[PDB]
Scaffold this active site. Structure first.
Site, PDB file in Angstrom:
ATOM      1  N   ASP A   1     -47.206 -29.551  13.204  1.00  0.00           N
ATOM      2  CA  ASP A   1     -47.030 -28.463  12.219  1.00  0.00           C
ATOM      3  C   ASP A   1     -45.939 -28.793  11.221  1.00  0.00           C
ATOM      4  O   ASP A   1     -45.094 -27.960  10.897  1.00  0.00           O
ATOM      5  CB  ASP A   1     -46.759 -27.123  12.935  1.00  0.00           C
ATOM      6  CG  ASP A   1     -47.040 -25.901  12.066  1.00  0.00           C
ATOM      7  OD1 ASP A   1     -46.497 -24.811  12.396  1.00  0.00           O
ATOM      8  OD2 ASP A   1     -47.788 -26.014  11.066  1.00  0.00           O
TER       9      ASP A   1
ATOM     10  N   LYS B   1     -34.674 -17.896  20.486  1.00  0.00           N
ATOM     11  CA  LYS B   1     -36.100 -17.712  20.294  1.00  0.00           C
ATOM     12  C   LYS B   1     -36.778 -17.196  21.545  1.00  0.00           C
ATOM     13  O   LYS B   1     -36.717 -17.804  22.602  1.00  0.00           O
ATOM     14  CB  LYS B   1     -36.728 -18.994  19.835  1.00  0.00           C
ATOM     15  CG  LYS B   1     -38.184 -18.819  19.446  1.00  0.00           C
ATOM     16  CD  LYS B   1     -38.705 -20.078  18.815  1.00  0.00           C
ATOM     17  CE  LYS B   1     -39.276 -21.015  19.848  1.00  0.00           C
ATOM     18  NZ  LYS B   1     -40.554 -20.431  20.427  1.00  0.00           N
TER      19      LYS B   1
END
Ligand SMILES: [Cl-]
Length: 275
Positions: A136, A36
């Site tokens: 989240d 990432k």
């Protein structure tokens, strides 16, 4: 030292607010990884390691939750580049994210939803025990290991250190955010996490989220468009109580009658996933 010699990079898995995520393999032992990348300019929340090294807050939070075995995808390594950070994370194989899974398969049988929801609860408890609030929790941030029946939590990019005082910032997913955030720009960590868990549970058993607009979130009227058991409905409605103090604690969720007799991950896969 070079990430490029240490990792064989494969295809782009996706991109968004979390940066760009690639499939990779660790060269030394062929371990499947996710790679990432995030641009430094695009990083909003910064932290620092014990040694005072400046890092994205995501790295700080990941380090806190990556000790030992858990239902959280672990950070294996990270690199700083002149204009970005690169994070090396575990990657389950074969895998499907829960949003994709629900989109393809529709509403989940309650037995399957129970097993998945339980695992998410255990992973969230783990985060909180390590002093991290994810902020989240949603279907797209849950990976399913399709062979093992294990769920793994991803994307700490909106997270924060867990605290007992009020949060006045939020950059998670709005349709999973609580009515007190929408109305007052104020929430507390655990009770906001429970609201998001209510949205997730409804999503699992109905195949879609209960609220789209702000006015619905603050109305908090929960209509079921699919057949859902009375006990399941009760738990969802409890998690989605308008007053944060009316929501259950994690203990109260896991002691709820709907949550009893959970399948093990392996049997969950054998019954519902192998195919
Ligand atoms: Cl980026």
């Amino acid at each position: 030292e070079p990430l490029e010699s240490q990792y064989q990079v494969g295809p782009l898995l996706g991109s968004g607010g979390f940066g760009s995520v690639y499939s990779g393999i660790r060269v030394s032992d062929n371990l499947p990884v996710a790679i990432k990348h995030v641009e430094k300019d695009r990083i909003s929340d910064w932290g620092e390691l014990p040694n005072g090294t400046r890092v994205p807050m995501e790295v700080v939070l990941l380090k806190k939750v990556s000790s030992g075995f858990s239902g959280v995808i672990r950070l294996l390594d990270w690199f700083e580049r002149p204009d970005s950070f690169v994070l090396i994370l575990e990657r389950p194989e074969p895998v499907q994210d829960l949003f994709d899974f629900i989109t393809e398969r529709g509403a989940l049988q309650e037995e399957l939803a129970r097993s998945f929801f339980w695992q998410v609860l255990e992973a969230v408890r783990h985060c909180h025990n390590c002093g991290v609030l994810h902020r989240d929790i949603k279907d797209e941030n849950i990976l399913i290991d399709l062979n093992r029946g294990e769920l793994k939590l991803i994307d700490f990019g909106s997270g924060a250190l867990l605290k007992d005082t009020v949060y006045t910032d939020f950059d998670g997913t709005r349709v999973y955010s609580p009515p007190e955030w929408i109305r007052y720009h104020r929430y507390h960590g655990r009770s906001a996490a429970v609201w998001s868990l209510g949205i997730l549970l409804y999503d699992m058993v109905c195949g879609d989220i209960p609220f789209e607009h702000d006015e619905e979130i603050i109305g908090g009227q929960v209509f079921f468009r699919q057949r859902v058991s009375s006990e399941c409905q009760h738990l969802i409605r409890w998690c989605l109580a308008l007053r944060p103090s009316d929501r259950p604690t994690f203990e109260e969720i896991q002691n709820h009658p709907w949550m009893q007799d959970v399948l093990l991950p392996q049997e969950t896969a054998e019954i519902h996933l192998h195919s």
